[PDB]
Amino acid sequence: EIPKPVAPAPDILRCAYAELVVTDLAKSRNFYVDVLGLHVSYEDENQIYLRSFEEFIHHNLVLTKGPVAALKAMAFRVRTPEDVDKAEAYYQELGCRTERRKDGFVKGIGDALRVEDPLGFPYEFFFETTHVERLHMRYDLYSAGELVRLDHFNQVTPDVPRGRKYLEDLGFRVTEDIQDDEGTTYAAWMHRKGTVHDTALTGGNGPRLHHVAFSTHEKHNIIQICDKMGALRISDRIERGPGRHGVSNAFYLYILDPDNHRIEIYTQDYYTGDPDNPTITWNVHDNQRRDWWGNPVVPSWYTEASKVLDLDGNVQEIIERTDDSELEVTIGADGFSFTRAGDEDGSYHGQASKGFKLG
Amino acid sequence: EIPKPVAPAPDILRCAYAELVVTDLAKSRNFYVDVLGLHVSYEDENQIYLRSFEEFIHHNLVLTKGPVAALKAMAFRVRTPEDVDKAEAYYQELGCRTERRKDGFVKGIGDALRVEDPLGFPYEFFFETTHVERLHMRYDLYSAGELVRLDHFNQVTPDVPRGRKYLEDLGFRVTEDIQDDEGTTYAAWMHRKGTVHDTALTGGNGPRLHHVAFSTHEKHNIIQICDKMGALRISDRIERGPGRHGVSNAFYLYILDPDNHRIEIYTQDYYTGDPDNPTITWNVHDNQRRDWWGNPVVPSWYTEASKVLDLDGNVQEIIERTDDSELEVTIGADGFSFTRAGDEDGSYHGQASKGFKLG
Amino acid sequence: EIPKPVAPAPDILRCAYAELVVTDLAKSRNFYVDVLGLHVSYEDENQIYLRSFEEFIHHNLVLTKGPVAALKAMAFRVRTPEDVDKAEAYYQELGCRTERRKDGFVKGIGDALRVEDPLGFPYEFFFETTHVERLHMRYDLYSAGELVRLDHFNQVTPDVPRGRKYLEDLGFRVTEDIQDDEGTTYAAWMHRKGTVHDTALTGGNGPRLHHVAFSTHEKHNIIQICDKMGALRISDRIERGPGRHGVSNAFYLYILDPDNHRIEIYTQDYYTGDPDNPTITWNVHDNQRRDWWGNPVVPSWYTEASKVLDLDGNVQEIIERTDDSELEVTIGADGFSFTRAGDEDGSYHGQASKGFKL
Amino acid sequence: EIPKPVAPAPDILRCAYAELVVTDLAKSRNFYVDVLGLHVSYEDENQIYLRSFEEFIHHNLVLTKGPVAALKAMAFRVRTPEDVDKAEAYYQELGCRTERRKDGFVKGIGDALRVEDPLGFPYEFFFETTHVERLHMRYDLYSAGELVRLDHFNQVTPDVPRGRKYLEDLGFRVTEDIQDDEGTTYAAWMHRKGTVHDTALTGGNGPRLHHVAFSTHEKHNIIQICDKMGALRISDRIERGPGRHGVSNAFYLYILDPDNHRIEIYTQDYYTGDPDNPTITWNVHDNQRRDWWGNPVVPSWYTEASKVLDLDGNVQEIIERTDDSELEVTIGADGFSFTRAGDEDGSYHGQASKGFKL
Ligand SMILES: [Ca+2]
Ligand SMILES: [Cl-]
Ligand SMILES: [Cl-]
Ligand SMILES: [Cl-]
Ligand SMILES: [Cl-]
Ligand SMILES: [Fe+2]
Ligand SMILES: [Fe+2]
Ligand SMILES: [Fe+2]
Ligand SMILES: [Fe+2]
C-alpha cells in the first residue's frame, strides 16, 4: 500500500497541460492545428505549444519531437508558489524521485517540480506561467469544431484502489466508479476543480496514458469533428463514438493522432464542487454505463494506450493487471452485459451489443 | 422488364402516410405517443391515427390492430382528384390488382386507390383528405425530440434495376445509388418532392418494408431521442446510430417498435428539385457510404424487415435476392471495405470497421 | 390592373441568383467572403461570382462593379430550355421591354431573357447554367456560420394586390399575408419551390429591392454570424434580429453590406408544396406577426431598400405608396399594436414594443 | 466605509437558493412549473419548493405566499457546519442583525443564519440540507427549455465600490466590471465557484434585487423559452433578449414572472477558478458591453427591480444613487455610446442603438 505523508498536501487547482512526445512534428501539426484548430502560442523545429479557445495560461499541450512517442508529463497547476515547495517535500517523504527547475522544463512555465509518482507517472506541479491573449471572445477565429478547454487526463494502472487511495490523500475527490458485486474495482473518476474529473484511473496494464480530453461548447461541435474527418477521408482515425456517456453524462468522441495518442472530445458534465456531492457506482455488466445508448465499446479502447517516460527519458516498464479484465467480463467470450438488471431480453452473452463479436 | 404503359402517369406530390398492422395496441401507443411524442388525430380500440408537428392533412401514420405485424399500405398524395383516375387506368394497364373506394380505406382520406404493384407492395393513391389544425407554431407542445415531418419510405426488393425503371416511368427521379465495378446495383434513392427521396429500393429478399422515416428540425433533437431511450432503459431498441449518412448526407438514427417495425429519424439533406440534379453513384466497398464516419453497419439492418400484405390481407410471399448481397461483400468473411481508394491502411478484409466481426 | 396573357406561363423552378451592382469590389469581397464565408466560383477585377455550400449551379450571387449601388437583375431558373421562349412570349404580350442573349448576360449562364416587368423590376429567366463542384459534403470547408442555400427575394412595391395578382398568373402561390380590418394589404409571401417563398412583396415606395436571403442548417449558425460581427466591431451593421418570425415561422437575422444592400439569414420554415396548403392571414396590428417574441421592428427596416436598374443601366424612377404604411399604423405617433386581441395589457399606443419610441 | 473584521470569513461554496414572496401562489406555479418546467421538491397551500435538473440539494427556489412581492432571502452554501458559526461571529462583529435557527427557516434546510447585511440585503448561510433525487440523467423528464442549474443573483445598490470591498473581504473575487474614465464604477461581478459570478452589483437605487439566474445546456434551449412564451401569447413578459453579453460572454434572456420578479436564463460563460484570473474592465460608453451584438438595453432593465425584506418581514427603505446613472450617460438625452472607440460612424448621441429613443 501507499502511505499518507505527515507533510501537508499541495493545493491543486486543475489539470493544466500535457507534454506529448511525437515522432514527426509536421504530421502532428497538420492534425492538432489544421484538422482540430488549436491555437499556437509558440513553435520551432523541435516543439509546438498549443492552447484551447478560452485559456489564458501559456499552453494546454506541448508537442515535443523525439524518438519514441510517449507521455512526457501530466501537469497540474497549484494555488500559490508555496504549494510547489509542498509538492517537493510531500513526494520526498513518499520516497519518490523529484526534479526541480526554477526556470521550468518548457517555455512559458516558471518554478516547476516534476516527479516519478508511486504508480510511475510523470507528474508536474507549478504555479508560475506566462499569460497570453485570452481568445474567448475572438469569434473571428472560431471554428465549427472549436475546442474550448482542457478538461481532464485518464491514466491506465493495474490496481485501481491503490491509486484511488493515494489520490484521495492528495485531495482529489471520487465522483463515480465501476465495480462488481464481489468487490473488484474497474475504474474511478476523481476531481479537484468541480467538474466530474481532473484525472481518472482505468484498470489495465500500466503505467500508460489512456487519453487527454478537451471540451466543446455544444454537442454539434463534436459532430462537426467527425464530419470533417470524413471529408478529409481519415475516418479510420475515429476510434469510438460519438455518443453519450453513462459515467459522467457527457457527450463524447475518441480520436487518434498520427502516433496513436488518444484524444477525447467532451462536453456537458455536471457540478461536483460541494464536499458531499453524491458518488455514483455502476455495475460492470451494465451495458448503459460507458455508452448510455448501449453502443459497444471497441476492443482497442481497452487494450491500446500510450507509453510514459521516466525523468531520464526512458520508457516505464509495464506492470500487468491480475484482477479481472473489464473487456473480458463484458464483451469477451465468457463475458456478458445487460440493459435491464435481471432481464434476459436485451442481454448479451459472449459478444458485444447490437449483433457484433470481437474481431 | 416492366412495360411503360400508354396511359399517362399520375402526378405524385410526396409520401403522405403508412398503415402498419401491430399486434398489441396499447404497447404501440406507448412507443409512438409516450416515447416519440407524435400527435393523435383520432383513436379508438382498433386503430390510432398519428401526425407530426408540421402536418396539416389528417395523419402521417395509422396503426391498425391485427394478428400479424405487417405493412398494409404506403400512401402517396397526388396533385388533383383526377390523378386518382389516372393511377387506376395506369396500373390496370400493367395488369395489377386494384381497389377503388369513394369513401376511403381509413378515416380522414376520401376517394382512394389501393394496388398490388408489380413488385408486390400495397401502394395507395389519394387526393382528398380531412384538414386538421397545423401545429407548426405550437411551441407549448414542442418536445426535445419533436418529429416534424414524414420524409420517406424504404422498400426491400430483390432486383433493384427492374424496380427503379418502373419507378422512373412513374415520374420518380434517381438522386443517389450504390453499385460496384462488376455492374451489380445494391440500392437506389428517388424523389418527387425535392428532397433526396420519397421512397427507396434496398436490395434484399422482398417484398418487405425496410423502414419509415420522420424528420427533426436539428441534430440535437435526434440526440434527445437516444438519451430518452437510455433513461427509460430501452437502449436495446436503438438498432443503429446515431450518425451521418454518406448517401443523402442526412443525420440519422434507426429504432425498432414493439413489433420490430424500424423507424428512422432524419434531418438536413439537400435540395433535388432541379431536373438536371447531378446523380451520385457510390461504390459498395467504400466504408463511408452508409455511415460517413466509418462506423460499422449492424447485421440486422441488412437481414431484418417487415412483412407486407396483399389487398385481401394475406402476407406477400418472399422472393430471394440472387444478385450479390451487400452484407456479404462488405462485412462477411470474404467481404472488403476501404476508407481511401487504393490504400491498405484503413481497409478491412473479412470483417467490419473499428475492430468488430459478425455475431 | 395587370392583364393575364392568353399565352402560357413559364414553368419556374425557383429563385437562383441576384446580380447586385456594388461600388468598391475589394470592400464587398471582404464582406461576402471573409466575414460571411461564401465560395468563389470565379473572380476578376470587375466581378465576383459567389455560391452557397450546397449549390451546384454556377453562382447564387454576382457582385458587379458600377457607379451606383443597385439591383441589376433577379434571376429565376425555369424547368426546360423552351420555358425561356415561353417567358419571352408572355412578357411581349404584356408590352414589356425584353432582351434575349443566347450566351447569357453573365458567366456560367447560357440562353437567357431579361425583362422590365410590369412593376418595374429586372427579372431574368434561364435554363442553361455551368455545373460546378457541389460543396455539400465538404466539411473541411465548413464555417461555423455556413450559408447553405439561396432562399428568396423581397421586393418593395407600392400596390401589393396589383403585384400579387400578376405573380399568381405567373403561377406563384401565396402562403402568408398581412392585412387589416379596413381593407388594406400590407404584404404577401409567395412560392414555386415549396418553402414559404421564392419572392415576396412589401408595401412601400418602389420599385426597390428589400433584401436577398440565404439559408443556414441550424439556428446556432445564425448566432455565430452575430458573434463574429461583434468580434470585428461591426455590430452597427446588424440592422435587426436575431429572432423568430411570425410569418414563415423562421429564425432570422438582417445585416447590411458596405453599399447598404440588406441580406437576411433564414432557417427552418415549413413545406408548402401541396396545392391546398392553407393560407395564413395576419392582422397588421399583431405584435407577434414579424417577430414572434414581440421585439420591435427597427424603423430603417421599413424605410430603406435598394435602387433597381432598368435594362440600360439607369435607376428606376420611384413611385410613392398612397395606401397606409405599416410603420405609421404600428409604431408611429398614431399607431397601435397588441399582444393579445382585445386586451389593454401588453398593448402599445404611439410607440414600439419593450419601452421605445422612434 | 465597511471595516475588515478580525474574525475569519466563512468558506462560501456558491449561491444555493432564493426565497421569494409572491402574491398569487397558483399563477406563480403556472409560470415556474408549467411554463419554465422546474421540478417540485415539495408544495402545500403556502409554499412551493423548486429545483433544477442537475441539483441534489432540496431546492434552488422557494415561493412563499404573502401580502407584498419581495426577496425574503438569498442563500449561500458554506463548506462545513463550523462555517455557520464563523458567519455568525463575523457579522456580529460588523454590527449586523442576526438570527440563527438550528432547524432552519424553510423545509429541507437545517442549521441556518440569516442576516441583514451592511447593504440591506437578507443573506442566508447554511451547510445542512436534505438530499433529493438528482435528475441529471432523467431524460424522460427533460424539456426543450430545461433549466439545469441555478447560476447567480444580481443586486442593486447605490455605491458599488463600498459593496465590492465588503464582498472582497468575504472571499468573493472580482472578474469583470464597468467603469468610465471619470473614476465612476457602474457595476461589478464576483464569484466563489469559478464561473463569472455568484452575485453581482448593479449601480442604482436600493436595496433591491435585480434578478436570479438559471442555466441551460445549450443556446437552442433558451430560444425555446421565447418561442413557448410566444405560443402562449405572453411575449410581453419577455423583457430583454435573447442576446450575447459582452461582460461574461454568456448567451442570455430576461423574463418577468407574474409579480415582476426578473429571471435571467444563461449559458456558456468561462472558467475563473485560478486565483490570478485576468480581470476585465469595460468602458460604460462601449455599446457591445452588455449586448455584444449592439442591441439597445430596454429602460425597464435599468429602473425596475424587486423589493427586499428585513428579518421582521418588513420592506427596506430605499436609498438613492448620487453617482452618475448608467442609463443617463448611455441612452438618455445627454448620453452617448460607441461601436468603435474614437469613431463617429456607429456612434449614438442622445438615443439608443438601432434607431430608437425612450
Ligand atoms: Ca469488383
Ligand atoms: Cl467510457
Ligand atoms: Cl445507410
Ligand atoms: Cl418580418
Ligand atoms: Cl447586461
Ligand atoms: Fe475521459
Ligand atoms: Fe432512410
Ligand atoms: Fe425575408
Ligand atoms: Fe445576470
Side-chain angles (χ1 to χ4, degrees):
Chain A
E1 187 166 60
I2 299 153
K4 177 109 77 70
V6 163
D11 187 337
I12 302 150
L13 293 170
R14 44 154 181 152
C15 73
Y17 80 90
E19 176 172 21
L20 295 172
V21 181
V22 303
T23 59
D24 180 331
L25 209 61
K27 223 260 192 89
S28 290
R29 194 190 192 285
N30 169 258
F31 176 86
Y32 280 108
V33 189
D34 295 322
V35 179
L36 295 180
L38 287 164
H39 297 275
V40 176
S41 306
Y42 169 98
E43 62 163 341
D44 57 41
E45 326 95 86
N46 290 288
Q47 287 184 302
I48 311 174
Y49 297 70
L50 294 155
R51 75 183 179 264
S52 69
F53 196 47
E54 303 188 346
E55 187 64 75
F56 71 91
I57 73 169
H58 189 262
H59 62 262
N60 292 124
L61 191 60
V62 190
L63 312 173
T64 299
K65 187 182 213 78
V68 191
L71 166 65
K72 194 150 189 203
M74 359 193 336
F76 298 98
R77 203 184 192 192
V78 306
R79 194 174 288 278
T80 64
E82 285 80 36
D83 288 297
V84 177
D85 285 348
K86 276 159 112 137
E88 186 178 66
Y90 182 104
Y91 282 107
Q92 279 182 354
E93 196 179 323
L94 285 169
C96 304
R97 194 186 158 178
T98 59
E99 170 129 305
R100 197 158 168 187
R101 290 217 201 141
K102 199 90 194 204
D103 268 33
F105 299 89
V106 297
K107 301 240 178 307
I109 307 290
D111 183 15
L113 168 94
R114 286 179 184 192
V115 298
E116 280 164 58
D117 95 343
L119 317 176
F121 287 88
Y123 268 14
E124 177 166 291
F125 293 101
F126 72 94
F127 169 74
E128 266 148 60
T129 185
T130 302
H131 298 191
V132 283
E133 192 192 331
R134 199 172 205 162
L135 291 174
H136 73 293
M137 305 201 61
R138 291 294 309 268
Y139 291 109
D140 61 321
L141 312 185
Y142 195 73
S143 54
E146 186 70 36
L147 299 184
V148 309
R149 287 169 220 216
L150 176 82
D151 188 67
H152 68 264
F153 302 128
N154 191 315
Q155 313 179 195
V156 186
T157 187
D159 196 320
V160 173
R162 188 156 169 273
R164 189 215 177 103
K165 199 259 161 190
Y166 139 86
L167 292 161
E168 303 193 338
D169 289 336
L170 215 42
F172 289 72
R173 290 180 270 123
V174 173
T175 47
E176 331 196 13
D177 78 341
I178 295 170
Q179 300 171 28
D180 63 28
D181 290 339
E182 298 166 24
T184 301
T185 303
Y186 294 91
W189 285 254
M190 49 241 303
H191 90 86
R192 281 302 291 170
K193 79 184 167 300
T195 70
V196 161
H197 64 320
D198 284 285
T199 203
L201 311 175
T202 291
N205 298 337
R208 289 189 286 172
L209 179 83
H210 201 277
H211 60 268
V212 184
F214 290 96
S215 287
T216 62
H217 281 142
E218 306 201 334
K219 296 185 279 281
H220 60 80
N221 303 107
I222 289 148
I223 284 152
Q224 156 65 12
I225 293 160
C226 301
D227 293 330
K228 185 170 187 185
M229 290 174 80
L232 297 174
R233 283 275 169 176
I234 57 172
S235 69
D236 52 335
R237 313 309 292 152
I238 307 155
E239 181 186 31
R240 187 179 144 217
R244 175 79 72 189
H245 284 309
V247 171
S248 87
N249 191 42
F251 202 87
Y252 80 93
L253 162 76
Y254 295 101
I255 57 161
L256 299 168
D257 87 356
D259 288 292
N260 300 305
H261 300 309
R262 182 188 282 109
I263 308 298
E264 188 181 14
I265 326 300
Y266 180 98
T267 195
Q268 287 161 34
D269 58 2
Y270 52 93
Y271 164 94
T272 58
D274 290 3
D276 67 341
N277 178 83
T279 61
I280 306 155
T281 292
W282 302 76
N283 187 259
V284 72
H285 304 289
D286 186 340
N287 196 52
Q288 282 182 204
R289 83 199 174 285
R290 287 197 169 278
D291 189 274
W292 188 236
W293 307 337
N295 274 321
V297 177
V298 314
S300 53
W301 204 87
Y302 289 123
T303 56
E304 309 305 299
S306 286
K307 276 162 294 203
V308 316
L309 301 185
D310 64 37
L311 300 177
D312 294 326
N314 307 302
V315 164
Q316 286 279 16
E317 33 285 320
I318 303 306
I319 305 300
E320 294 193 22
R321 189 170 164 81
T322 53
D323 267 306
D324 294 308
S325 150
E326 177 157 10
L327 183 150
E328 296 273 36
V329 306
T330 68
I331 50 173
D334 294 333
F336 80 94
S337 62
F338 68 66
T339 300
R340 292 166 294 280
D343 186 8
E344 290 286 300
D345 293 0
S347 263
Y348 305 109
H349 298 264
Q351 68 185 49
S353 52
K354 326 256 194 221
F356 286 116
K357 61 162 234 199
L358 282 203
Chain B
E1 87 208 323
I2 296 162
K4 172 132 98 221
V6 172
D11 183 348
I12 297 159
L13 297 163
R14 65 170 155 134
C15 55
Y17 81 94
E19 201 181 356
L20 299 169
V21 183
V22 304
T23 57
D24 184 324
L25 201 53
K27 279 186 158 52
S28 287
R29 187 186 200 286
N30 184 252
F31 176 89
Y32 282 110
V33 172
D34 293 324
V35 183
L36 292 191
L38 292 153
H39 302 274
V40 170
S41 303
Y42 171 89
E43 59 179 319
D44 67 2
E45 68 185 10
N46 287 304
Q47 284 192 329
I48 303 153
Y49 292 66
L50 299 180
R51 65 173 194 283
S52 58
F53 195 59
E54 297 191 341
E55 187 57 80
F56 70 90
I57 75 174
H58 196 249
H59 56 262
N60 298 137
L61 194 64
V62 191
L63 317 177
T64 291
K65 173 184 85 235
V68 184
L71 175 95
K72 191 142 127 106
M74 37 200 310
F76 303 93
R77 209 185 180 207
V78 306
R79 188 167 286 276
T80 67
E82 279 92 353
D83 287 288
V84 188
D85 293 301
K86 295 201 210 126
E88 191 179 47
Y90 203 87
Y91 279 100
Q92 283 183 356
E93 186 170 342
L94 294 164
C96 298
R97 177 132 135 73
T98 77
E99 233 208 319
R100 181 71 163 272
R101 283 202 216 188
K102 226 91 279 192
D103 287 314
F105 293 82
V106 305
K107 307 216 173 60
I109 305 300
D111 175 53
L113 181 91
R114 291 178 173 197
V115 309
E116 303 180 27
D117 97 332
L119 308 182
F121 289 93
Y123 270 21
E124 191 185 274
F125 306 92
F126 76 97
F127 170 76
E128 259 186 275
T129 180
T130 297
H131 293 194
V132 301
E133 179 192 345
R134 198 173 196 169
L135 299 182
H136 71 280
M137 296 195 93
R138 292 294 308 278
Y139 288 109
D140 50 324
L141 311 173
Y142 192 75
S143 71
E146 191 63 36
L147 311 183
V148 304
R149 304 183 207 204
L150 187 82
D151 196 66
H152 68 262
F153 312 120
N154 188 309
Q155 293 170 239
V156 173
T157 200
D159 188 336
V160 177
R162 195 207 193 209
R164 146 200 185 148
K165 199 259 166 184
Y166 155 58
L167 277 185
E168 278 179 320
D169 278 340
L170 197 52
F172 288 80
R173 225 86 148 70
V174 172
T175 62
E176 316 193 31
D177 70 341
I178 296 184
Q179 282 184 56
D180 64 22
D181 62 12
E182 295 120 318
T184 298
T185 291
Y186 299 86
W189 281 256
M190 62 268 285
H191 80 100
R192 295 279 303 162
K193 75 180 175 299
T195 70
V196 172
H197 57 321
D198 295 284
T199 194
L201 312 184
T202 301
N205 315 335
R208 282 183 309 157
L209 168 78
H210 199 280
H211 60 263
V212 183
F214 295 86
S215 64
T216 70
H217 279 144
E218 310 198 323
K219 301 180 278 280
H220 66 80
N221 297 101
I222 287 166
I223 306 275
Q224 165 63 15
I225 294 168
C226 299
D227 281 340
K228 187 156 177 209
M229 292 178 77
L232 300 169
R233 290 263 173 191
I234 60 177
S235 60
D236 65 322
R237 313 306 291 166
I238 295 162
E239 186 185 37
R240 164 163 175 227
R244 167 78 71 190
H245 278 306
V247 185
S248 84
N249 197 45
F251 202 82
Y252 81 83
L253 172 66
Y254 299 98
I255 57 186
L256 296 168
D257 96 352
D259 292 297
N260 303 321
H261 302 315
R262 183 184 284 110
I263 306 285
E264 181 184 8
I265 317 294
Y266 184 92
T267 188
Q268 283 161 30
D269 65 350
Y270 58 83
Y271 162 79
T272 57
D274 283 15
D276 69 343
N277 187 74
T279 304
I280 301 157
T281 298
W282 305 74
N283 180 267
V284 73
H285 301 287
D286 178 341
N287 192 52
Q288 290 191 191
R289 79 194 179 288
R290 292 202 170 273
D291 185 81
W292 186 236
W293 315 328
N295 277 326
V297 174
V298 318
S300 69
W301 201 89
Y302 289 127
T303 65
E304 307 305 305
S306 317
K307 276 74 70 84
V308 315
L309 308 176
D310 70 40
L311 304 171
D312 314 302
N314 316 324
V315 171
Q316 285 281 27
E317 64 168 282
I318 312 290
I319 310 290
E320 305 197 287
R321 191 180 177 75
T322 75
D323 289 358
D324 279 3
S325 151
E326 176 177 358
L327 186 148
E328 253 347 284
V329 302
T330 67
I331 63 174
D334 307 284
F336 176 74
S337 279
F338 60 84
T339 304
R340 285 162 302 271
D343 194 358
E344 199 89 68
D345 289 341
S347 64
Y348 306 109
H349 283 278
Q351 58 179 257
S353 51
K354 333 294 197 189
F356 288 121
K357 231 185 193 144
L358 275 217
Chain C
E1 169 150 47
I2 287 156
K4 177 188 159 76
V6 135
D11 190 347
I12 291 147
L13 295 178
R14 64 170 166 134
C15 58
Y17 80 91
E19 189 184 11
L20 295 170
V21 174
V22 307
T23 60
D24 191 299
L25 206 61
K27 213 162 278 221
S28 299
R29 194 187 193 283
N30 173 257
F31 189 71
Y32 284 101
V33 183
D34 292 330
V35 174
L36 283 191
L38 285 154
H39 302 269
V40 182
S41 297
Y42 181 79
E43 67 186 319
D44 56 43
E45 313 291 25
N46 300 327
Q47 289 184 323
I48 302 161
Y49 297 70
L50 300 172
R51 67 164 192 287
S52 65
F53 191 70
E54 293 190 340
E55 190 54 64
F56 77 101
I57 81 183
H58 182 268
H59 62 253
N60 300 125
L61 186 66
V62 180
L63 314 173
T64 296
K65 196 154 126 58
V68 184
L71 168 75
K72 184 149 184 164
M74 31 196 328
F76 308 89
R77 185 167 201 213
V78 299
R79 165 188 299 286
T80 66
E82 19 286 306
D83 289 287
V84 184
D85 293 318
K86 265 141 134 218
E88 197 181 17
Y90 201 89
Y91 283 99
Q92 262 169 225
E93 204 194 324
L94 305 165
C96 294
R97 254 210 95 183
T98 61
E99 230 217 287
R100 176 81 164 275
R101 266 110 201 276
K102 63 147 201 201
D103 295 306
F105 294 83
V106 299
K107 297 197 170 40
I109 307 291
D111 191 21
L113 173 89
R114 286 186 174 187
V115 335
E116 310 176 32
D117 95 339
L119 305 191
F121 282 94
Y123 276 4
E124 190 179 273
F125 302 97
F126 70 99
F127 185 68
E128 294 187 303
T129 178
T130 294
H131 293 184
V132 301
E133 172 190 352
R134 197 172 207 163
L135 305 182
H136 76 297
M137 303 194 71
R138 297 292 312 269
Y139 300 102
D140 53 324
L141 298 180
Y142 199 70
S143 194
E146 189 76 28
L147 303 189
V148 314
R149 312 178 208 179
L150 184 72
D151 189 79
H152 73 259
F153 309 127
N154 194 304
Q155 303 169 220
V156 185
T157 198
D159 181 340
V160 172
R162 181 170 204 254
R164 168 215 173 117
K165 202 236 146 226
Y166 152 68
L167 288 168
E168 271 171 14
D169 287 348
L170 205 59
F172 288 80
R173 283 201 265 103
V174 167
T175 48
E176 306 206 36
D177 70 357
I178 296 165
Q179 300 182 33
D180 72 17
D181 64 3
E182 275 163 280
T184 302
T185 300
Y186 293 92
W189 277 263
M190 51 249 303
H191 86 91
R192 290 286 298 171
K193 71 171 174 302
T195 62
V196 160
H197 61 331
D198 285 293
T199 193
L201 305 170
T202 298
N205 311 331
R208 301 184 290 172
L209 172 82
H210 194 278
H211 58 263
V212 187
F214 289 93
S215 302
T216 68
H217 280 143
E218 306 196 335
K219 286 179 274 286
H220 64 81
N221 291 115
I222 298 189
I223 301 180
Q224 163 57 17
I225 294 170
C226 310
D227 290 329
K228 180 146 167 201
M229 291 176 78
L232 306 174
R233 289 273 168 184
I234 57 180
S235 59
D236 57 328
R237 316 303 284 152
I238 293 159
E239 200 188 20
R240 180 179 151 215
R244 166 88 62 194
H245 282 310
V247 172
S248 83
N249 192 39
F251 202 80
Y252 77 90
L253 172 75
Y254 296 96
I255 64 186
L256 297 172
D257 91 355
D259 300 282
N260 273 52
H261 305 301
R262 185 188 277 109
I263 297 299
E264 185 177 6
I265 330 284
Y266 190 87
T267 185
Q268 284 164 36
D269 72 344
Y270 54 90
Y271 163 85
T272 62
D274 288 18
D276 65 345
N277 185 76
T279 63
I280 314 179
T281 300
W282 298 77
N283 185 278
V284 68
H285 299 280
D286 181 347
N287 195 61
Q288 311 189 173
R289 87 199 171 275
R290 284 196 186 276
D291 192 273
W292 176 239
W293 309 338
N295 282 329
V297 170
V298 307
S300 85
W301 202 92
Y302 287 114
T303 64
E304 310 305 320
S306 297
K307 288 141 195 192
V308 344
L309 298 179
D310 72 11
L311 281 183
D312 301 309
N314 305 317
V315 171
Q316 276 291 19
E317 237 193 81
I318 280 154
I319 284 151
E320 239 195 314
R321 172 173 181 85
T322 54
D323 299 336
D324 295 335
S325 108
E326 184 162 3
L327 178 140
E328 289 299 337
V329 305
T330 54
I331 73 194
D334 290 329
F336 183 75
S337 44
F338 63 79
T339 298
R340 298 168 288 280
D343 183 12
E344 206 76 59
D345 283 336
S347 90
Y348 310 102
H349 305 247
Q351 73 203 288
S353 36
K354 321 294 186 184
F356 292 120
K357 213 159 249 152
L358 316 159
Chain D
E1 238 223 319
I2 289 160
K4 189 135 145 56
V6 14
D11 192 340
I12 301 157
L13 294 171
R14 52 156 178 152
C15 60
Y17 75 90
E19 172 178 26
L20 291 175
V21 191
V22 293
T23 50
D24 187 324
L25 192 50
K27 273 178 228 232
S28 303
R29 190 187 196 287
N30 171 251
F31 192 70
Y32 287 101
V33 188
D34 296 298
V35 178
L36 297 189
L38 291 163
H39 298 278
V40 181
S41 299
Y42 186 76
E43 67 184 310
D44 63 15
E45 41 253 71
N46 290 282
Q47 273 170 336
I48 304 167
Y49 289 72
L50 303 160
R51 79 181 179 264
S52 42
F53 196 63
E54 302 185 343
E55 191 48 85
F56 68 94
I57 80 192
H58 189 263
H59 56 273
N60 303 121
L61 194 57
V62 197
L63 316 175
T64 290
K65 187 184 195 290
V68 192
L71 161 72
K72 194 154 167 142
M74 18 187 344
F76 297 102
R77 208 190 187 196
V78 297
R79 190 173 286 277
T80 69
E82 292 77 23
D83 273 297
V84 178
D85 294 278
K86 290 173 182 234
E88 179 160 56
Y90 189 81
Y91 275 95
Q92 275 185 11
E93 171 159 27
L94 279 171
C96 287
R97 224 183 123 193
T98 65
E99 196 180 348
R100 192 141 177 203
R101 308 248 204 119
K102 318 214 72 54
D103 286 320
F105 289 80
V106 297
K107 287 178 189 64
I109 299 266
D111 185 26
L113 185 84
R114 298 193 174 179
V115 300
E116 284 157 35
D117 94 351
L119 300 167
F121 285 89
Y123 266 16
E124 199 183 76
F125 297 100
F126 84 90
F127 166 83
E128 277 164 10
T129 184
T130 299
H131 290 195
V132 305
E133 184 187 344
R134 201 176 200 169
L135 301 177
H136 72 294
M137 307 196 66
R138 295 295 310 287
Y139 292 101
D140 56 325
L141 301 177
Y142 186 88
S143 104
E146 193 78 29
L147 308 180
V148 315
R149 304 153 212 207
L150 173 71
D151 192 77
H152 62 268
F153 310 128
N154 180 316
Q155 298 164 225
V156 187
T157 194
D159 188 329
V160 180
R162 193 182 180 246
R164 185 210 181 106
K165 191 265 199 201
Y166 155 71
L167 295 162
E168 285 183 345
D169 298 330
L170 218 53
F172 287 79
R173 293 198 243 103
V174 161
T175 57
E176 306 196 44
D177 63 356
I178 290 169
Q179 260 170 71
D180 72 359
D181 302 314
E182 242 130 26
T184 297
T185 291
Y186 292 88
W189 272 262
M190 55 281 265
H191 87 97
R192 294 292 289 176
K193 65 177 188 308
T195 74
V196 165
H197 54 327
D198 280 299
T199 187
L201 294 183
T202 296
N205 302 318
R208 293 179 307 162
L209 172 76
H210 207 277
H211 58 251
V212 183
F214 284 97
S215 277
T216 63
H217 283 144
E218 302 204 329
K219 290 183 280 288
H220 62 82
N221 304 112
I222 294 191
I223 292 159
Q224 155 76 355
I225 295 162
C226 294
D227 290 329
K228 184 172 201 206
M229 300 176 81
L232 289 168
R233 286 269 162 194
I234 60 174
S235 58
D236 60 320
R237 313 305 294 175
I238 299 169
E239 191 188 30
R240 185 182 147 210
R244 165 92 65 188
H245 290 310
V247 177
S248 86
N249 201 35
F251 199 73
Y252 79 81
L253 174 69
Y254 303 89
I255 65 183
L256 300 175
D257 86 0
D259 290 284
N260 303 108
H261 300 324
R262 188 186 278 111
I263 308 292
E264 197 181 9
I265 327 297
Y266 187 95
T267 193
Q268 288 164 37
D269 71 349
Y270 53 91
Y271 168 76
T272 66
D274 281 23
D276 69 328
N277 189 66
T279 282
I280 316 186
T281 296
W282 302 73
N283 193 260
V284 74
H285 297 291
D286 173 353
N287 189 63
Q288 303 199 168
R289 80 194 176 284
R290 290 181 175 286
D291 195 274
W292 188 236
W293 313 330
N295 278 329
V297 180
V298 305
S300 96
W301 207 83
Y302 284 128
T303 60
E304 308 298 313
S306 279
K307 294 160 204 171
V308 318
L309 302 178
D310 71 11
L311 293 191
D312 292 326
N314 295 322
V315 169
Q316 303 271 27
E317 44 245 311
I318 251 109
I319 293 296
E320 243 149 55
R321 184 186 174 77
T322 51
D323 296 318
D324 289 25
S325 170
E326 179 171 0
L327 180 158
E328 287 290 346
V329 310
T330 61
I331 65 180
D334 280 65
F336 69 91
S337 69
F338 55 75
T339 306
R340 288 158 304 270
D343 190 353
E344 277 284 359
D345 250 85
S347 67
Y348 316 98
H349 286 261
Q351 68 177 249
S353 53
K354 316 292 208 207
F356 301 123
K357 35 166 111 300
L358 315 152

